[PDB]
UniProtKB/Swiss-Prot annotation, chains A, B:
Record text on activity regulation: Partially inhibited by 1,8-naphthalimide (NAP).
Post-translational changes noted in the entry: Proteolytic activation by host furin cleaves the protein in two parts, Diphtheria toxin fragment A and Diphtheria toxin fragment B; which remain associated via a disulfide bond.
Disulphides: C170-C172, C428-C438
One CC-aspect GO term: extracellular space
Catalytic residues (positions): E132
GO terms of molecular function: identical protein binding; NAD+-diphthamide ADP-ribosyltransferase activity; nucleotidyltransferase activity; protein transmembrane transporter activity; toxin activity
Protein species of origin: Corynephage beta
Name listed for the protein in its UniProt record: Diphtheria toxin
Keyword Transmembrane (UniProt): no
Chemical reaction(s) catalysed: diphthamide-[translation elongation factor 2] + NAD(+) = N-(ADP-D-ribosyl)diphthamide-[translation elongation factor 2] + nicotinamide + H(+)
Record's subunit section: Homodimer.
Domain of life: Viruses
Keywords in alphabetical order: Cleavage on pair of basic residues, Disulfide bond, Glycosyltransferase, NAD, Nucleotidyltransferase, Signal, Toxin, Transferase
Site feature (Modification inactivates enzyme) residues: W137
Length: 499, 499
């Protein structure tokens, strides 16, 4: 229940607390009062819990304060977050509430190691290296409170201030949204007055029409609009990737038009709620294949401007100043949300236990240890990879393994693939490229209701460590179906060499 | 390293061994000699390792024998399959090979509990409830060997005998392949002589043409062929599901035609290797959405016959008697392989740790325990669900949770969703249908490089157990994007009530 190795005593222990609009000044007078007071070691995560509760989606952000305990504070790292489990294994009373007990003197004398108080620690969240602190309200009164930042003060639009701050974490998408807002406004205006564009508007049914005809018309609008000099960079960077095609801008606009009614358009929170549940926003953001391609102020402004003009056109055909106002404001917030996710450290597909999703298949390391190939010893290791597919039966042709004579050979007897429990042995051969190819001895298919475990076993005959120079690739390649140049569907599981 | 609770002593301990063609009689004379002798508790898995090594894919199957140890045998269940790890934690010599040591007297006196010998036990495979036994060769000589079945003797085609046997496990797809082979042959013949069909053949370019034109022509062949009286049931059962459409038969045939050259067509193993790596076989098998729809001899024969005739037509257009011979023989084996997987007990999508794959999203319970909701006590439990998507950012609108006043309420403070480590709190409300809907307080998107953990926390105020009558559904519903009738992409995680 408690990780002693991660627990410690600190003089002048501080942390951070996200603060709602209206409370940034009053909090600095003290910590008063919801059954516990929460803080974190990361001021950027604190920035997260600083948005107005009435309008969580698009509301104003307050700020972040820093709180410090005088004297010695004992930080007690917890293994579990279960109140009952905790009071049980510690030998504490199972009656009184745990956090109340934590502030008692008998508790502090026993777990404090001489500290004036105990603060409980828990991993902030899955996928985060931050910690969350749980503070007893009484003990919390000792906290001095200092301002870290007040987002309001910055006097910026929407949630720009909060996101600009968060982006400091990565020293990285760090855009000036002021510039983007100004350019977006400029381009939408210049686009409305452009002759060729004014023309195409005049060819609009301007009435509720078939969805198919609306899309057809919007695609033509897109094509003509994209020819405007103030959208020239956008024309170039969107000319090649299918995700960024006119068809996808048109599909987005028609979708926006279909979900936005009068009352929705009139409220920013309601508009954000509605836009936030739509598919296809990546086309407008310039986001595909794990990358944010639209990452200059100039290009983001152009895409948002084009989108806005098209939504304007869609409303009459399948659905007001919404297009240039709430829609722009709202979509800017969604951009910021997504950009923020991409700025955060995370595992790419096929790394650790994140699946690799491709051609209808899904594969992943069974556990994190599987994805590690330990080195510098003699002996065997085993590595499990889960494999399935979405619907109809799709084949698994085999697997490509990195091998190093002596330092990393395939154990051909222990390597196998199990399909719904049917254990299938494999035939393994070294091929051109410092790679061993294994094929199943019976046909393998996966699909809805049929899954496999590929078990890779490695053998080490030398105690010598693998130099990062002797491996050609950092991935195990699982091969799916074949599709005058033959090619296999390639499913990658990425590993790390350790120890 | 050793699971005592699963270990035991047995008088007259037996198991099963799969036996290659040519060895079914000689083995019954004794067990001689590859560093260890393998057997299993399941005679049907044994049937698996009974196929000719020169031709593992489509070769002949030998049989299964039963082997019995006289007197008392100690079965020692192992926790790990790592030789080195084992010799270490048991205090055995780290020099001599483990299996050799296992047959020594000093070993048997220590772990045998009075048994005449020890046999080591390991889980057969991931997804199987079978066990595999590892037998020391010397001790193996004591085994008496009795015949269980000899597949050769049965005098059937291909691997029919082996698969017919395996299908006995589920008392269930249990087809008579003799009947299917006979009917398939009959229909292909009757189809060749049919006037309307003979006609369409005469409209064939009968020469290497464009892939697109070949497909176009094959689709017309399909349409006309499907009108034949001996294919009438097939016409009906394939008329509605897109997977079974003419376009998909045509795509299959063109694919077969493109991978089969002269030398391939002339060898059954080579043909099976090549067919086995193609996509789209589910269209011919009548397999979609987790179900085998073509599950009568009559309908399987019709589909195979139609496929054969179309492959015949494809070879001239994009590529011999291959179509009616090796192709039929080969595809029958692939049918049997897949039917076998579906006969085997397995977890459907969204059950245990198997992902639910839908609309570009992938979701799954993080671990098996997560998928269990324990009942009959007072307190909290937590349940983690992994969530991501394949490419562009797709939204998560929220989650539908089953709730029972008092016996199963949502803990609204501990429930949250973390996106690349950004912890997002949720707003939860009871809606029509004994269901609580939670929505994130910030927009959630997942995609390539952005993943979330949805953490569901439940609270129990009553010690009374949940009767299987008070829950409306057996699933937690995660909601994805929205798409004049609004509907959310529905992502299901199925749970079980225990304790």
């Amino acid at each position: 229940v408690v990780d002693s190795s991660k627990s410690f005593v600190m003089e002048n222990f501080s942390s951070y607390h996200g603060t709602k609009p209206g409370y940034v000044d009053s909090i600095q007078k003290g910590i008063q009062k919801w059954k516990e007071f929460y803080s974190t070691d990361n001021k950027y995560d604190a920035a997260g819990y600083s948005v107005d509760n009435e309008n969580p989606l698009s509301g104003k952000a307050g700020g972040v304060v820093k709180v410090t305990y005088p004297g010695l504070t004992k930080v007690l790292a917890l293994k579990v977050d279960n109140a009952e489990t905790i009071k049980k294994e510690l030998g504490l009373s199972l009656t009184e509430p745990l956090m109340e007990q934590v502030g008692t003197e008998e508790f502090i004398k026993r777990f404090g190691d001489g500290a004036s108080r105990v603060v409980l620690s828990l991993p902030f969240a899955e996928g985060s290296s931050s910690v969350e602190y749980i503070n007893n309200w009484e003990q919390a009164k000792a906290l001095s409170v200092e301002l870290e930042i007040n987002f309001e003060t910055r006097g910026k639009r929407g949630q720009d201030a909060m996101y600009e701050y968060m982006a400091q974490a990565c020293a990285c998408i760090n855009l000036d949204w002021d510039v983007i807002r100004d350019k977006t406004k400029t381009k939408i205006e210049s686009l409305k007055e452009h002759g060729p564009i004014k023309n195409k508007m005049s060819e609009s049914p301007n009435k509720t029409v078939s969805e198919e005809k609306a899309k057809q018309y919007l695609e033509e609008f897109h094509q003509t609009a994209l020819e405007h000099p103030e959208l020239s960079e956008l024309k170039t960077v969107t000319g090649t990737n299918p995700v960024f095609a006119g068809a996808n801008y048109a599909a987005w606009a028609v979708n926006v038009a279909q979900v936005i009614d009068s009352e929705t358009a009139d409220n920013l929170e309601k508009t954000t709620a509605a836009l936030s549940i739509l598919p296809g926003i990546g086309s407008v953001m310039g986001i595909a294949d794990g990358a944010v391609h639209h990452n200059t102020e100039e290009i983001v402004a152009q895409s948002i401007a084009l989108s806005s003009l098209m939504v304007a056109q869609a409303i009459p055909l399948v659905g007001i100043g919404f297009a240039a106002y709430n829609f722009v404001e709202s979509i800017i917030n969604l951009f910021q949300v997504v950009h923020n996710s991409y700025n955060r450290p995370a595992y790419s597909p096929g790394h650790k236990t994140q699946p690799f999703l491709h051609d209808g298949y899904a594969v992943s390391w069974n556990t994190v240890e599987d994805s590690i190939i330990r080195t510098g010893f003699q002996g065997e290791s085993g590595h499990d990879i889960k494999i399935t597919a979405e619907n109809t039966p799709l084949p698994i042709a085999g697997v490509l393994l990195p091998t190093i004579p002596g330092k990393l050979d395939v154990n051909k007897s222990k390597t196998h693939i199990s399909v719904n429990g049917r254990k299938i042995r494999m035939r393994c051969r070294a091929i051109d490229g410092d790679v061993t190819f294994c094929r199943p001895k019976s046909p393998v298919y996966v699909g809805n209701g049929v899954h496999a475990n590929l078990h890779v076993a490695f053998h080490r005959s030398s105690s010598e460590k693998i130099h990062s120079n002797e491996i050609s690739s950092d991935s195990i390649g699982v091969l799916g179906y074949q599709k005058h140049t033959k090619v296999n569907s390639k499913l990658s599981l990425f590993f790390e060499i350790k120890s």
